[PDB]
Amino acid sequence: SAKDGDVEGPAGCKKYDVECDSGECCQKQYLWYKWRPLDCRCLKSGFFSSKCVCRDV
C-alpha cells in the first residue's frame, strides 16, 4: 500500500508543493489516496511574493 509523500519516477525528483525546472513535476504522487500528476503552477494566496510549485492537475 502507498502513503502520503509517495511519488513515481527517478529517485530524487520533485514532490507536491516544491519548485522545479521547466515547470516539470514528477511523474505522479499519491494525493488524496489517489495517484495524480503534478504541475508547477504559479499562484499566490493573499501573499506578497508569489511562488511556483507543483500541484495536483
Instruction: Sketch the domain layout of the chain as residue ranges.
Output: 1-57
Cα(24)–Cα(47) distance, rounded to whole angstroms?
24
Find where cell 493573499 sits.
Answer: 46
Method for this entry: NMR
Distances (CA, A) of 5 to 13, 18, 42, 46, 50: 12, 12, 21, 26, 24
Instruction: Check: CB of residue 30 under 8 Å from CB of residue 9.
Output: no
**Cβ count within 10 A of residue 48:** 5
CATH topology of domain 1-57: 2.30.130
Beta bridge partners of 50: none
